[PDB]
Amino acid sequence: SKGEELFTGVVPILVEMDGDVNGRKFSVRGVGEGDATHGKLTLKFICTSGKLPVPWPTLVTTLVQCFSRYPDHMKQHDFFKSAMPEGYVQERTIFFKDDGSYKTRAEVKFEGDTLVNRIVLKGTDFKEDGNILGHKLEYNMNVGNVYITADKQKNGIKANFEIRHNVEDGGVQLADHYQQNTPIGDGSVLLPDNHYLSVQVKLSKDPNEKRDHMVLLEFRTAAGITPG
Ligand SMILES: [Cl-]
């Protein structure tokens, strides 16, 4: 890409989320930076409406796959950078097993030299004493492997993956993700062969921060195609 030229160094990131779960409105802002040459990004998120009504880990996938590192033999398969700077709309539906669902729509694009992820999330039908509204999930994140394929119905790509959220005192809460990304521009974008993004996340807290928050470190690598 010429889009890939925009990712040769550290890129600042701004994330904004307007959320609503079972009618309860909330907002999140995140700031940080990503470096695709290191397949790494770091973000700190604050709940800018007080206390978060769902567990932080359930929002990780919603809250910039542009920073995945594609190896040389897979560069032709990086849709995300190819769509830049005009960007793409990412839509997901996330189904929490035996509980409610999130519907998300985000625009990801450069605004000047900052990458911006602007999100609206709406969650419906959650159980008041379920794992989500009840805050019964551990503060951590398991590895996710996002399987990407060309979308033959709309312009761009689709993906499917399931996230396992550890539940306090044992067991898991599954979150089944459906994803579509559609370029914003009219310009040509790369159409990838099937592959996946392997994503590892470490969640932490800022010892000096009294607001409800999440510090995220994330490593993301493309794979699923043997070298050559
Ligand atoms: Cl267990």
Which domains are seen in the chain, by residue range? Answer: 1-228 (2.40.155.10)
Q: How many residues does the chain have?
A: 228
CA atoms of 176 and 101, how far apart (whole Å): 9
136 CA from centroid of ligand 1 (Å): 14
Contact 48, 29 (CB under 8 A): yes
162 CA from centroid of ligand 1 (Å): 18
Widest pairwise Cα distance in the chain: 51
99 CA from centroid of ligand 1 (Å): 20
62 CA from centroid of ligand 1 (Å): 26
58 CA from centroid of ligand 1 (Å): 19
CA atoms of 101 and 63, how far apart (whole Å): 16
CA atoms of 134 and 5, how far apart (whole Å): 44
Contact 148, 195 (CB under 8 A): yes
Question: Resolution reached, in Å?
Answer: 1.7
206 CA from centroid of ligand 1 (Å): 28
171 CA from centroid of ligand 1 (Å): 5
Beta-carbon-side half-sphere exposure of residue 59 (alpha carbons within 13 Å): 34
Instruction: Collect all residues with Cβ–Cβ distance below 8 Å to 216 and sequence separation of at least 6.
Output: 30, 32, 41, 42, 43, 44, 45, 60, 63, 201, 202, 203, 204
CA atoms of 213 and 228, how far apart (whole Å): 43
159 CA from centroid of ligand 1 (Å): 28
Count of C-beta atoms within a 10 Å radius of residue 28:
24
